[PDB]
Every structure is written in C-alpha cells, then in structure tokens.
C-alpha cells in the first residue's frame, strides 16, 4: 500500500501537464484513488478521483480542465490538466480511499495512504541552478543556496548521517525572481577538525547535485 | 431508439449504431460461404452522457447510486442490445444448403 | 458543498485541552462521512479520525472526534509538542460533483517557556565575493516566542530594505524557533564599509545582543 | 464465464464481476421497501483486450479487427445475466412481496 | 477538413508528453486518425491509430510506450507517450484515413489529409534564444541567427512580403550545443535604401520575435 | 511486417522517366492496400496514389502505380523540376500489430546543366563584435563544392561548419554557406577573402 506521484515540475501557462501516480501493494480494481492539491501555504483542496469501478468524478471548479484516469496494467493513476494557470502551482498529492469500495461500510471520507506529493510550478521563468556558498564561523555553520528557480532544493548534511542540530530554512523569494535559502547546523567546539562537514544540495530541476565543504 | 432508422441518417457522436460491412472471404477468411459475399454487421460506439440511453433496472440503480453515494461505482459504455440472425448459403458439391447464423447483425445499441 | 473550520489559528500549552470545529454547508453523506487529518509541514497529511469519531491505528487516545449531520468537533484532551500541525477536516457528499471537500485548516502552535536566541553571524564567503554580490547571515537559534527583531548596522549605521528573513516551523520536540536574516549588498558597496553588526532584540534578552565582525578576519 | 464464483476468487483487473452492496434508503432514496435494507447488486468492470465470444457477433468483430487493417469497435466489460430480487413493502397496510426483475448482475461479458 | 497538431516542445529524458491533434472538417466517428513520426532527416514511421470505431492499434516496436485516444466532443485525438528516450526526437503528424470506415471498400493504406507536424525534442538541455546579427552588402544581403535551442526557428523577410532570393538555410548544431542558421536575399543593385530590407526571425520555444533592420 | 524501397537515392533529368519499387516482406491485405506519398522538405506527405494504382484527383497523371501482392512500383513519367522530393510507400496489413507500415523513402534529385555559383562575402556586424563572417555560394549545380577560407593569408581547418539548401523547385539550383565564427583571434586580423573550387567555374 504505497503511492508515488511523479511528473511534476516546471510548465508555463496554457500548457498541459500529466502527473502520474505509481501504486503498489493494492489493486486499482479494489481501491478508489483521489488527487488532492495544496497551494504553497494554503489548505488542501480535493481535485477529484477515479473510483474502483472506473468512474471519474471531479470538483465543481475543475470545469473539465482536469481529467483523472487510470491504467491498471501499468499500475498507475493519471491526473492531466490543460491550459495551466498560476493558481495551479501546488503540491499534488495522490490519496487513496482508506477501504476497499463496494462493501457495506464505506471509507467514511477517510483517505490513507497518501503520496509524498510532487511540486508543480507554472511560470514563464527559466530553470537556473543554484550557487552554493559556505557559511563558516558549541558553534554553528552551514550552506547558502542562492539563486535558483523553481523550487525545491534538498539540503542534507554529510550524506544524512548528521541529522540532529540542523535547520534547513524555508526558501525566500528574492526581488530578482529567484529564491534563496540557508541551511545551518550546530556542532561541538571539539569536533571542528575531529570530523569534516559538507552539505549535499540537490536541485532536481537543473539536475544540479552539489556537495560543498565547510571550513574556517 | 438507437437503431438504423435514427442513427444512419443523423450525425451523432454519442453512443449509436455505426455502419460496418464485413466481406466474408477477405475480412474473416470464411471461405466456406458461397453467398452473400459479405454483410452489414455494424457495431455500437460513442459516448454515454446524461439520460442518453436507459438500460435495465440495474443501469438505473447504478446511476442513481453513483449520484447519491460519494464513492461511485462503474460508468456505462456503448454496447449492442438487439441482435438479429443472418441466413447464408453454402455448397456441399453442387448441392446448396442454408444455415441461419444467430446473432450476426447489430440492429440497435444501448448504454450499460 | 463547502466546509468551514474554526478557529483558523491556535496556540496552547502542553497539557491543555484543545478543541476544533468543522461546519458543513449541507449534511455529509450518511451524516457521519467526516474525517480528520493532521499535516506537519512538508509531509503529506495523516488521517487521524474517520467516521467523525472512529480512531485509527497508530494514533494516540488523546485525540477524539464527535459530532454529526453538519456540526463536528475534534479534541486533543492533552496537547503535546509533537502536535504542532495544521489539522484539516474532510466531508463526503451526494451530488454529481464535489464528492468530498476539505475545510480551511487550523494551525496549532505550542506555547512554552521563553528561551533566548543563540545568535551567530556569518560573513560572505570567499566564493561569493568573486562575483557580483555578497550576503551576510545572522542566525538566531532555538528561541520562543516567534516575536524577535533583527536590525543590521554597518559602520554602526542602520540598514533598511536590503535584508530578508525566514523562520523555521516550530520544532516537534522542544517547540523552539530559528530565524535567518540575510543582508544583501553589492560587492562594491560591501567594500566601502568596515563594521558589520547584527543586533537582536528578543524578550528572553534583558538588553539587545549584538554580534559583529570586520571584513578581513 | 465471469460469474460470482470465478471473479471473487481471484481479484483480476481484466473484465470481471465486482461486489457492490447497496442500501435502498441510504444510497438510492427508496424508503418504501420495508425489507431487505440493502443487497449485493454487483457490477461489471475491468480491461477487455482483443473478447468474450458469447454471441457470434463479438467473435466476428474480434476477428475482423485482426484481419482488417482498420479495426472497428473495442470491447467493454458489461452486464450479461441478470436475476431478480425478492422484496417486501406495505404501502397499503398489508404485506406485499413481489420479485424485482433485473436487480442483480450475476455474470459479465466483454462486448 | 483539417488536422492541427499541438502539445510539442522540449521534454526531459525519461519524462512524458501528450500531444493533441485538433480535427475540424470531419467527424471522428467516421474517420480513423493515425500518428506517424519521422526523425530529423529520417523516414516516416507509423506509430499507430485510433479507429473510427474506437479501437487503437500500435506498431510492434511501441511496446506500450504510446497510447492513442480520442474525444469527439473535444474534436481531438491524443498521442500520450511516456519514458521518452533520446530516439523519439522527431516531428509528429496526425494523418486522417482517406475514406470513412466500415464501408464495403476501405482506405487502401491511404492517409489524407495530413497535419503540419509538431517537433518534439527529447534532451536534458536548456531553452535558449537566438541573437540576430545582419550581413550587409544586382546584389544580396542576409541575416544570421546564432546560438539558440531547441529547433526550429522561422525567418521571414520584410513582413514576409518579399519571397524572392530568400534561402533560409538548414540549421546547424554548433560545437557548444546550440544552433544557428542564415537567410539571404538577392535584390536589385539599386534602390537599396529606397526600400527597407528587413528580416523578422522568430523563435518559438523561447517566445522571441526579433525584427532586425538591415541596410548599408 | 516490413517493406523495403529501392533505390534509396536517384537522380534524373527533366523529361526522363523514373521507377521506384516498393517490396513487402509479407502480402498486403487484399493485395492492393499500398499507397504512395510525396514529401517536400518541411511539409507533410502529399498523397499521390491509393490502392496501388488509383490516382488522387488533381494529382497529375505523370504518376502511376502498378503492382500487386508484394511487389509494387511507382513510375514518374515526364519528370518535372517541381518533382524533386522524397517518395514513400505505405502498406496495410492483417494482424494485431503493425497495421500499416512505411518504406525507407527515395530522394529524387533532378539533373541539371552544370551551373556557376554567384559567390558573396559578408562581414560581421558591430552588433556581434561586442561579444563571425560568412561565405555564401548562390544558385549553383551540382551540389558539391569545396570551401577554404582565408584571413590575413592563412588557411585554417577550424571553422568546420557549412550547410546547403534543398534543390529549388524551379531551377534545381542550390546555395551553400560556410561559417567563420572566438573573437579573440579575430581582433587583430584585417583582410578576409574567399575562394571556391567548383566545377561550373574554371579556376578557384
């Protein structure tokens, strides 16, 4: 019982996107699958679903701009949206009905499991990779990811071994139209030199994968 | 009703009777029929929107259900409803003989 | 078909009971098709309660839902710092459109003893200086509440309109915050000035705390 | 044959019978049946690849689409055999009991 | 009777794309529609069709990578391809069958009408845009359109109102990874200056529309 | 099922008559589901002949299809200058895959009285320099030429890019362009000249 959506990313207005949702551990002929979406910072909104029995129902505002469909042989569910708008920038979630459908008791408006979501940005701007700079001096240090569009970035520390004491900040939109972000970490005054520290930043849209190394 | 009387004179994209002619010899390899060389089998195809075609009790209940219940079941598609036999003529030797094949002609469609 | 949950925001102390309400424009199907979900930032929502009251496996007995028809309540008997999250409610309905819907959200923030920020100040690295611009980062680590003022001073003179802040979502365990103030300057305009200082005013500090440096260590 | 016995045994994505219980008052708004309160109606659903050859027509189309370069219809998983259901109502203060024809689907076909 | 393709551009290796043929003078419940593609400088290649009766068939090498579909209310047919390898860079046409389907006599492997084609570029890559430098002087002149991506790019000459001596050259892939081309026009040795000889390059995957004045 | 076309390329003269043969690995349905298509460069295929022999109305009679079963030929009778194109055959099949299939194409190029290139030098703009010069041969036949640049009396096998037109539909003439682009080395140099080894011209 696991769902993973894919196909998100950067597409400009009026264009079309097809997101996909790979299912595993349950059958598309038993479970109804929904698409939920979230504007950055706003609440979840139900797009629609494709039911166990194969019937697609939508929310009022879709107005036929979205078609939700499935393919049981390829194990997946599709949400395709035409003539895209800026207000369609959102994380897109693949949410499964909790219970198998058609039984005497239903799912009672419950959804579980859910997918990690995938970000869909709509914009005219062009993918720029990030510049990665060192933030260098119990003491703290980190990395300054700067100038990148669209979101997101994955900032991890020393391959994810170093996890406690890190704060990856939320990205900020600069006036230039690109985003900026810093991630920081706190370590013992002994360790500086005992161990070395490097951030692994990953901006998937420009396939930029950087490892920077911090130092005084 | 979704018959030839209505569907062959009128242009429609909803579920209707659709013309189709099948040459026995070339389109099936049924070399054993002497006559006729082919025939109008037709088929059923197109969309099923709101109140387009009624079917049985069961189709009505499924569509009501699908509206009243949050987790809709199955949606209807376009299929045959009334079939009709076809009489063909073949030969053993110079001897004619007639067989009536059942359910060879689609004469009307429905949504199910 | 629309749901409205009050309140929009909420802060409460560890151990306090908190209750949220969902209001439906029309009755949910079978009068009890309403779930509750809990979303923490960046993760997908987590179903807590279904059928308006039935709990789910993996979910503490502290939460409990009740209500019916059109008026529902979710209840955390005894709040805890893990619970910082937005809580959404979901309803199911008849009709040939809008089969389900979510309410607007309730952000729950935890309240704790105040804690002064540990302030650090990073200068622009050598790499960035070799370009156009330069960035000076002030970091306030681990502090409550979110109320905190950060003011930049260059050669003691106060700056405006050239910095920007971002603050982390509350910590799931200690309920503290972290702020990062980055000041952006042109390498030319960076060179002209000597003293670079970050002045933090927080309620866990008796007087403001300044952290500063000089270009060329 | 895609009847209740085959299809329930192995949950397949190809055309099959599928279980669907239905409560009269709760799901259709039929408040006049005194009893039963619901029933397994079922439905038909699933992939149909190139045919359930019950009726000669569907055989003819299945073959035509192979030999002709320009194929015609595609199949679809639809009801086949329907059986009634026995109800009970009293709109008239005395017990009635009819058979409601074509209320359950017991088999499915690609067609 | 027309068929207008759309949906095309550059797409990331391994992604997905959906194209749409917009059909005008005929009904999709009488005519099959086919999708054929051709690589740059290669032959045509039948990928498959969606028949008047609603049946889709594919070339043997498609292997479920392509799905063809139609909507008669939307008047369009769709070619949905996923998992785009480099190979699949090509122009794509939808071609109608010549004759209605199900008639005693067929179409005889004849396709008519055809669509203009839409280019699809599978590459990691990065959209750029063309700079436009003139080439100045019976005599002749030219415009040079340098460093852009991906293909293709139009060039007209004085609002397309001059159609003699124009030879827009094939585009060439520079060592960098971009493209460039030239277009030149022969014109009377006199009256240059009395007439305004202007070229109007127009790249589309970047929404560029330069109108480069050319004079002595 | 696949089908093979011969010959892949061929050149002939105005008035001459040309034969292209398509040949199918497997029999085509009804033995006459084979069509023939004209494709100009940068256009969709035009339909010439359907059913192996029928001519599309308004397509000219100098095109004719003959053949059946597995062997087919297209015959262009009185070749025209506007008949330069690539020529494809499509066929229909039975089975549940590859219902239709195209051939490899045949590029037909028209033969021409040998002609002289009008050569032009073009120097760069004061637009590009603030961050490239071209040699152009115009309206010539045959297609083949050899270009060597010179700047201040040095050749250099360094600017390895040229591109040529597609045969014009009225003259069967051409047009080559060769590129001279890194401003570093350009800045000093002063005298720019071109010289082309063709056949329609006596000496470079």
Residue numbers in the entry:
A (entry chain D), E (entry chain F): 2 to 138, 147 to 225
B (entry chain B): 303 to 414
C (entry chain C): 2 to 218
D (entry chain A): 303 to 352, 354 to 414
F (entry chain E): 2 to 132, 136 to 185, 187 to 209
Q: What text appears in the publication on this structure?
A:
Transforming Growth Factor-beta (TGFβ) is a key driver of fibrogenesis. There are three TGFβ isoforms with highly homologous receptor-binding domains with high sequence similarity, and have similar effects on target cells in vitro. Humanization of rbt4A11 was performed to enable development of a potential clinical candidate for non-human primate pharmacokinetics and safety studies.
To investigate any structural differences in the TGFβ2:Fab complexes for both v2 and v7 variants, we crystallized and solved the x-ray crystal structure of TGFβ2 in a complex with Fab from h4A11.v2 to 2.9 Å resolution. The overall structures of both v7 and v2 complexes are very similar, with two Fab fragments binding to two TGFβ2 molecules and the epitope of each Fab containing contributions from both TGFβ2 monomers in the dimer for the h4A11.v2-Fab, as previously reported for the h4A11.v7-Fab. An analysis of TGFβ2:h4A11.v2-Fab and TGFβ2:h4A11.v7-Fab crystal structures revealed that the epitopes of both h4A11.v2 and h4A11.v7 antibodies on the TGFβ2 dimer are identical. This, along with identical CDRs between the two variants, suggested that the functional differences observed between the two variants cannot be explained by a potentially altered epitope. Supporting this hypothesis, in the TGFβ2:h4A11.v7-Fab complex structure, the corresponding residues in the heavy chain framework region are S19, S79 and K81, which do not allow for the specific interactions observed in the TGFβ2:h4A11.v2-Fab complex.
